[PDB]
Write an enzyme that holds these catalytic residues in place. Sequence first.
Site, PDB file in Angstrom:
ATOM      1  N   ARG A 104      14.765  -7.460  17.080  1.00  0.00           N
ATOM      2  CA  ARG A 104      14.677  -6.257  16.244  1.00  0.00           C
ATOM      3  C   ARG A 104      15.956  -6.159  15.408  1.00  0.00           C
ATOM      4  O   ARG A 104      15.916  -5.699  14.267  1.00  0.00           O
ATOM      5  CB  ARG A 104      14.474  -4.970  17.077  1.00  0.00           C
ATOM      6  CG  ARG A 104      14.056  -5.198  18.547  1.00  0.00           C
ATOM      7  CD  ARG A 104      13.283  -4.041  19.231  1.00  0.00           C
ATOM      8  NE  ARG A 104      12.966  -4.377  20.627  1.00  0.00           N
ATOM      9  CZ  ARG A 104      11.946  -5.150  21.002  1.00  0.00           C
ATOM     10  NH1 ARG A 104      11.119  -5.655  20.093  1.00  0.00           N
ATOM     11  NH2 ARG A 104      11.742  -5.411  22.288  1.00  0.00           N
TER      12      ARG A 104
ATOM     13  N   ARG B 270       2.482  16.132   9.273  1.00  0.00           N
ATOM     14  CA  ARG B 270       1.618  15.912  10.413  1.00  0.00           C
ATOM     15  C   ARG B 270       1.685  17.078  11.384  1.00  0.00           C
ATOM     16  O   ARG B 270       0.682  17.522  11.930  1.00  0.00           O
ATOM     17  CB  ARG B 270       2.023  14.601  11.146  1.00  0.00           C
ATOM     18  CG  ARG B 270       1.725  13.354  10.312  1.00  0.00           C
ATOM     19  CD  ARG B 270       2.177  12.051  11.036  1.00  0.00           C
ATOM     20  NE  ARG B 270       1.602  10.864  10.395  1.00  0.00           N
ATOM     21  CZ  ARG B 270       2.263   9.722  10.283  1.00  0.00           C
ATOM     22  NH1 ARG B 270       3.535   9.600  10.741  1.00  0.00           N
ATOM     23  NH2 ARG B 270       1.673   8.720   9.703  1.00  0.00           N
TER      24      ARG B 270
ATOM     25  N   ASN C 104      10.866   1.135   5.866  1.00  0.00           N
ATOM     26  CA  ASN C 104      11.286   1.389   7.239  1.00  0.00           C
ATOM     27  C   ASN C 104      12.174   0.300   7.772  1.00  0.00           C
ATOM     28  O   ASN C 104      11.952  -0.847   7.449  1.00  0.00           O
ATOM     29  CB  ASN C 104      10.072   1.530   8.162  1.00  0.00           C
ATOM     30  CG  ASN C 104       9.380   2.871   7.978  1.00  0.00           C
ATOM     31  OD1 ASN C 104       8.159   2.942   7.837  1.00  0.00           O
ATOM     32  ND2 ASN C 104      10.170   3.937   7.951  1.00  0.00           N
TER      33      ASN C 104
ATOM     34  N   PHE D 150       0.799  -1.210   0.000  1.00  0.00           N
ATOM     35  CA  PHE D 150       0.000   0.000   0.000  1.00  0.00           C
ATOM     36  C   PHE D 150       0.840   1.270   0.000  1.00  0.00           C
ATOM     37  O   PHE D 150       0.381   2.275  -0.498  1.00  0.00           O
ATOM     38  CB  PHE D 150      -0.977   0.004   1.177  1.00  0.00           C
ATOM     39  CG  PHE D 150      -2.019  -1.076   1.043  1.00  0.00           C
ATOM     40  CD1 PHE D 150      -3.037  -0.945   0.115  1.00  0.00           C
ATOM     41  CD2 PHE D 150      -1.927  -2.245   1.758  1.00  0.00           C
ATOM     42  CE1 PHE D 150      -3.992  -1.950  -0.050  1.00  0.00           C
ATOM     43  CE2 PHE D 150      -2.875  -3.256   1.598  1.00  0.00           C
ATOM     44  CZ  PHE D 150      -3.895  -3.101   0.667  1.00  0.00           C
TER      45      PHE D 150
ATOM     46  N   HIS E 150      13.264   9.232  11.771  1.00  0.00           N
ATOM     47  CA  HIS E 150      11.827   9.004  11.553  1.00  0.00           C
ATOM     48  C   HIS E 150      11.430   7.830  12.488  1.00  0.00           C
ATOM     49  O   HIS E 150      11.499   6.680  12.104  1.00  0.00           O
ATOM     50  CB  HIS E 150      11.554   8.685  10.082  1.00  0.00           C
ATOM     51  CG  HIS E 150      10.165   8.199   9.776  1.00  0.00           C
ATOM     52  ND1 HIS E 150       9.042   8.988   9.914  1.00  0.00           N
ATOM     53  CD2 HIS E 150       9.728   7.023   9.253  1.00  0.00           C
ATOM     54  CE1 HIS E 150       7.975   8.314   9.524  1.00  0.00           C
ATOM     55  NE2 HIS E 150       8.363   7.114   9.122  1.00  0.00           N
TER      56      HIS E 150
ATOM     57  N   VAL F   1      13.590   3.923   7.695  1.00  0.00           N
ATOM     58  CA  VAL F   1      14.002   4.578   6.482  1.00  0.00           C
ATOM     59  C   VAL F   1      15.411   5.207   6.591  1.00  0.00           C
ATOM     60  O   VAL F   1      16.167   5.200   5.632  1.00  0.00           O
ATOM     61  CB  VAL F   1      12.939   5.643   6.071  1.00  0.00           C
ATOM     62  CG1 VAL F   1      12.799   6.742   7.161  1.00  0.00           C
ATOM     63  CG2 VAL F   1      13.295   6.290   4.698  1.00  0.00           C
TER      64      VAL F   1
ATOM     65  N   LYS G 158       0.929  -9.755  -9.344  1.00  0.00           N
ATOM     66  CA  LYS G 158       0.382  -8.685  -8.527  1.00  0.00           C
ATOM     67  C   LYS G 158       0.727  -7.313  -9.158  1.00  0.00           C
ATOM     68  O   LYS G 158      -0.152  -6.442  -9.325  1.00  0.00           O
ATOM     69  CB  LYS G 158       0.914  -8.817  -7.106  1.00  0.00           C
ATOM     70  CG  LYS G 158       0.908  -7.565  -6.258  1.00  0.00           C
ATOM     71  CD  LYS G 158      -0.342  -7.370  -5.468  1.00  0.00           C
ATOM     72  CE  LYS G 158      -0.053  -6.561  -4.198  1.00  0.00           C
ATOM     73  NZ  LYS G 158      -0.626  -5.171  -4.262  1.00  0.00           N
TER      74      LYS G 158
ATOM     75  N   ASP H 158       6.272  13.232   8.909  1.00  0.00           N
ATOM     76  CA  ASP H 158       6.144  13.716  10.282  1.00  0.00           C
ATOM     77  C   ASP H 158       5.935  15.243  10.266  1.00  0.00           C
ATOM     78  O   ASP H 158       5.184  15.792  11.054  1.00  0.00           O
ATOM     79  CB  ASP H 158       7.386  13.367  11.127  1.00  0.00           C
ATOM     80  CG  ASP H 158       7.738  11.875  11.053  1.00  0.00           C
ATOM     81  OD1 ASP H 158       7.140  11.118  11.793  1.00  0.00           O
ATOM     82  OD2 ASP H 158       8.504  11.462  10.161  1.00  0.00           O
ATOM     83  N   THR H 159       6.652  15.892   9.385  1.00  0.00           N
ATOM     84  CA  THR H 159       6.575  17.353   9.224  1.00  0.00           C
ATOM     85  C   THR H 159       5.171  17.795   8.722  1.00  0.00           C
ATOM     86  O   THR H 159       4.569  18.751   9.256  1.00  0.00           O
ATOM     87  CB  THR H 159       7.675  17.840   8.262  1.00  0.00           C
ATOM     88  OG1 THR H 159       8.968  17.666   8.916  1.00  0.00           O
ATOM     89  CG2 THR H 159       7.462  19.354   7.898  1.00  0.00           C
TER      90      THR H 159
END
Lengths: 314, 314, 314, 314
Positions: free
Chosen positions: B89, B152, B121, B13, B176, B123, B40, B149-150
């Site tokens: 992680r 937002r 990510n 997406f 980020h 990123v 796809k 983010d900016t």
Amino acid sequence: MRNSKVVVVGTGFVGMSYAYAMVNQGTVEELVLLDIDKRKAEGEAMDLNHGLAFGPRKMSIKAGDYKDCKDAGLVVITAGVNQKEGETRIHLLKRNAEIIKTVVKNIMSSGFNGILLVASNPVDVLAYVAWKESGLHHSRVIGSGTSLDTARLRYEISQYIHIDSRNVHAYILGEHGDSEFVCWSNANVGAKPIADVIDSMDEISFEDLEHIYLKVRDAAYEIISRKKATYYGIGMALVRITAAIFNNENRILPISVLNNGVYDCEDQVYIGLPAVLNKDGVHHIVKLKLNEKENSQLNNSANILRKNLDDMSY
Amino acid sequence: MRNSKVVVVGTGFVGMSYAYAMVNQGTVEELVLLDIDKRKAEGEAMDLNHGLAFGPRKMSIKAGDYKDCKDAGLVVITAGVNQKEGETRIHLLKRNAEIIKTVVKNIMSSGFNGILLVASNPVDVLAYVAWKESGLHHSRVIGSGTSLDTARLRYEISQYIHIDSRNVHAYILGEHGDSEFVCWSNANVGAKPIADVIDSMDEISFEDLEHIYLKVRDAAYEIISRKKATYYGIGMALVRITAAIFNNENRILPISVLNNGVYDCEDQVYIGLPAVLNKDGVHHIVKLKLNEKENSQLNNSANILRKNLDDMSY
Amino acid sequence: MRNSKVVVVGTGFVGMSYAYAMVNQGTVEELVLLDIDKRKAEGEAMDLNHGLAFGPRKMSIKAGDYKDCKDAGLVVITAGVNQKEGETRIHLLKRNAEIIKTVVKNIMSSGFNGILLVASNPVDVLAYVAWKESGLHHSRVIGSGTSLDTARLRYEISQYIHIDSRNVHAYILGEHGDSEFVCWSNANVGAKPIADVIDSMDEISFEDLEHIYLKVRDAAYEIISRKKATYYGIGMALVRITAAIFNNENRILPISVLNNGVYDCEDQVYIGLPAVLNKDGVHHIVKLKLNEKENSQLNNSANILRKNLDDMSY
Amino acid sequence: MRNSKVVVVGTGFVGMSYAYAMVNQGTVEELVLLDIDKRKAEGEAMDLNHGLAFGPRKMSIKAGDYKDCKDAGLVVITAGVNQKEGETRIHLLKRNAEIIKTVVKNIMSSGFNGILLVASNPVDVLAYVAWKESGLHHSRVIGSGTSLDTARLRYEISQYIHIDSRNVHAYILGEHGDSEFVCWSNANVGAKPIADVIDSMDEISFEDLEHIYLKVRDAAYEIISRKKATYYGIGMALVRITAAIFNNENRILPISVLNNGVYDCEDQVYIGLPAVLNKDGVHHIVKLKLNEKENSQLNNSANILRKNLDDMSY
Ligand SMILES: [Cl-]
Ligand SMILES: [Cl-]
Ligand SMILES: [Cl-]
Ligand SMILES: [Cl-]
Ligand SMILES: [Cl-]
Ligand SMILES: [Cl-]
Ligand SMILES: [Cl-]
Ligand SMILES: [Cl-]
Ligand code: NA
Ligand code: NA
Ligand code: NA
Ligand code: NA
């Protein structure tokens, strides 16, 4: 006086592809998202709002309730359900009709008096249902009909003759579904009849036409089988319908409309026909001279929808 | 000479919201979609193509292969993987680095010599990885960084003071992720410093600022928890970055870039900083005068990314 | 509820460059052209209409009369006269005030209750005149003020630092004329104060600033001396003001507005100040913290306009 | 590879309305203005540049010299002269041919190898002249031909039937001048032949068609007699031609092109015919099936231009 508010009912990928396309095109000022899952609609409004600082138009976007419909110029209905294991097609048809009925009653309760645009499938029958349950004049209730099938047709033709698809003027008519058909007798490229294009260009032949119809017929299935669902195409078709109305264009687009005696097929069906759209909704349906084959195909398509509606006791 | 071709790698997406937004904005002429699932990508190209007859710009859109990168002006990488049950992680970080490495090697094999834009990510670390594996100059490899983010942040501020968010000029800097921070010392509305706005307007106070930072911090989580994933926002951020490059704008946007001594934090990290973008990529990084708190926060953020990179033996 | 109709009074090159720019941008749906020379307005409407089949938006364009103002959302006044041989400046000032008065009385006779935008020169004094003669609230009457001077300033700065002029956030304030001045204390590029830009970039120095002010001061003269009149610049400034209002943006633009105690200069003058525009007109004037020099310059500019108005017995 | 630079030769109201329309539409990145009066071109570049901070696209605009043509993708020629007192039409025709020749030689001296678009009148003969003097292939040299006449026709028809003019698909063919004619045999609204529209709609009759032709014939005169010159219409026609080329659209537009055996009229004339435009210039001329009357009218029109060219010893 002009309106610039759209409400989207159902925030699945059809409703949200439509909303996102509007945000990127700057189609209207105000957008309200409704969903039975309120948290989901709120998340979708956040995600749209976060792109606005990069968007072409100032907009107001929020998740809302049916009362927000009161002064909306347009409500676009995408709500509905999928077939359950074991479920007959008439059963499901009836479950979707009850959903549309409920949505439409809730919309009308708000005091809404704008235009309804149904994109839920099966769109021709559900547009009729929405029309009947709304109490509104049929010029104010439409479905997306064969507008996307028509864009697909233009795309396919453009790939043969290497002409901007926007110069390809040809319609898919009838049921948005298996009984749709190409109106080849009224098809042109620029101002040039398609039969003349075929004679002129080695790039396109009579045989290609039947192939193109099949491609258009199979397009949804093809996309669904590859990426689970189709939604970018209808999203841009819905934007275009919306723009014709809010920009008051008197634009001719093939959409689901109440035949009502314009063509000689069944009068009491919504069916995909070219229609003139402006700020007031459907100005009139354009009556094409169909050839014998096409008229027969339109009758077949209308009979199929009328039988569906009868079976739903509409 | 100018290019007008973008390749999108990964059609989930994020990549497809980006592609659809470009189609609706008419950002470029040519789009190529790449995905490890070729069927796809083909379905996604069909679904985009079918809306073009209603779109603002003639475009060429297809699913393709790495060889199509050869004359692309920009490749946008969205590929990657999700954490598995039980997975550390650092393990996952390393699995994503190997994916980026493989994508980038395949891109470079084509003869490609354009710009790389990483949206995958995390990123900032993956942009560094792409930079190193590509062999390209760091001005030609960027990540989307804190551009969303900016946006937002601008959205949130606009809701307090009821000013067009596009008039709100303030940045989120740094990673980020959890260590990003607001640069309040260099924030204005129109030309007016934010501190003066606070003094003037009852609508916004010092307390609101910390709240707004928290909202920005929690925005992704909030959206994911409501609609499974966030993607409309980043899609429009990626469009804006793309437009700055193809329209040769010399536009200042906060993106992931190689610090390289511009700020006094770690030199060898990609990190979210305001940068000038034009047709050649990053013209230079804009150096803001940070206050003591912000400089400390930038150092913290850079140290975190550098530790991540060390741990991946980069 | 939203309006989408603009009336243009005076079809000289300012009014018509404005109208043509709106047609090419698709700013509004409906345009009405008024001119004391009715045949001329009719010719201008023909010439605009003939390009619409190639334009981005369906529009309705016609030459009309004052009665067409009745339901207009905005009337833009460009009418006025040029100095005659031997004529004093106060005489001419008074002849232009009488023209504005007559236009405004004729507009109000129609039942009009929208917004007035004055572009006629001298725009600050004539905006005050239009305000007084209209009987309307001052938030509904504005002039184009220093919006174009401000665009010139942004252009000039952009040529030194090679940054998109739309990222340059700095204002020209005061009289649109010889006493205007740059507000350097509140000027930034992106989010970065101009003083910091000067320190960072070899491309721009303190000396350049005074030069840039002179360039901005002399720009009209320079253009007039080369091509007889200036009009493309103001045409796009007027479009931008119009778009802020019809798109309900809450956009900050420097325009002619009634000070009315916001700044500590003369209260009863229209003067170029940054203001928030939305569908209702001026939401409020933005109050910048001016330094001692700028405050003095604003006072000087306001005193000059107040003396002009006194001399016209306003 | 793509180009985004246009040079405009002659900065009178045709060239500058074209340039301003491009600035407001954001058609290309780079614009260079050439005029024998260098100061005038410089003033025009100032006036355009000053509106850019309010424009939709970053652009580079300057006054230049013929050497700036070297890497231009398109040069648009608007230069020429007006009839002097006592001057024969053949004399003036020859003076304009010598101007075009000189412009074109100067353009070719630069190393230019892009497309030529002639808008100077009489455009069909001067396009032929430019073609011959340029040494370029005829697919790379065009004139604006009857593109504006065609937009006028669509506008006039739209006023009878109240349909978006952009849905009206009909051409004016032949000489841009007194011998042009409507191709009624290949005219439709949407996909519907015009004869069927006439039968369906009380709004339009056979008698209206001859009236509409007369209106189209007299349109330039009508505008000139009211506002001295016509230029907004051609400005938007030239933008549309430009956009078809730079957006690589394969768009069908009626323009001046070398017949060269496509229609059975004179082969060696430039004349207004529908043609497919893309980034490489004219892909091919579209051959319509003309009825007996139209074919005769095309022959008449071609004979007239061929006699003009003979008389100029071309
Ligand atoms: Cl609204
Ligand atoms: Cl849904
Ligand atoms: Cl390209
Ligand atoms: Cl993916
Ligand atoms: Cl309106
Ligand atoms: Cl005037
Ligand atoms: Cl270029
Ligand atoms: Cl000229
Ligand atoms: Na053929
Ligand atoms: Na406050
Ligand atoms: Na400096
Ligand atoms: Na009729």
